[PDB]
């Protein structure tokens, strides 16, 4: 008869653990590993700062219950 486009949106928060002495590359790698979140395709901003791979969690002072935003491919 007639077709439909069903737009499945997943706007949702996930929870993981991490250590202060780990690098950021590990965080983006472990969310890639577990959830299938592509790090460079889905650009991360933590507490209002963009994450450099070479830095540690403690470098930005990742405290507990902290929130990271995942933005998909913009530009």
């Amino acid at each position: 008869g007639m077709q439909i486009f069903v737009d499945t949106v997943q706007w949702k928060t996930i929870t993981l653990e991490v250590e202060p002495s780990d690098t950021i590359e590990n965080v983006k790698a472990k969310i890639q590993d577990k959830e299938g979140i592509p790090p460079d395709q889905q650009r991360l901003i933590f507490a209002g700062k963009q994450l450099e791979d070479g830095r540690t969690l403690s470098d930005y002072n990742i405290q507990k219950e902290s929130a990271l935003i995942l933005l998909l491919t913009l530009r």
Binding site: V9, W11, R43, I45, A47, G48, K49, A67, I69, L71, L72, T73, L74
Partner: protein
């Protein structure tokens, strides 16, 4: 590999870059998540405004006025009381 893209104003630098960061959220957000209430992106901007010294926390008129500007610039589409980016020009 970008560093020198901030300018020199000795004041207005931080402000522009804070608002541009807020626009880095809402632009990249609506690029895929093309359907959300003002209250959603309000809650997000306010999260990332309070976590840092960003404008010493914004206000309604600032954030609402930010959306208002975008709509009056045609850089935002206002649907039925809900915001989304003009992913089409016409």
């Amino acid at each position: 590999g970008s560093e020198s893209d901030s300018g020199m104003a000795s004041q207005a630098d931080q402000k522009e870059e804070e608002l541009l960061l807020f626009w880095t959220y809402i632009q990249a957000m609506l690029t895929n998540l093309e359907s959300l209430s003002l209250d959603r992106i309000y809650n997000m901007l306010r999260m990332f405004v309070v976590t840092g010294p960003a404008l010493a926390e914004i206000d309604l008129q600032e954030l609402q006025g930010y959306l208002q500007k975008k709509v009056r610039d045609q850089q935002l589409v206002y649907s039925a009381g809900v915001y989304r980016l003009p992913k089409n020009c016409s």
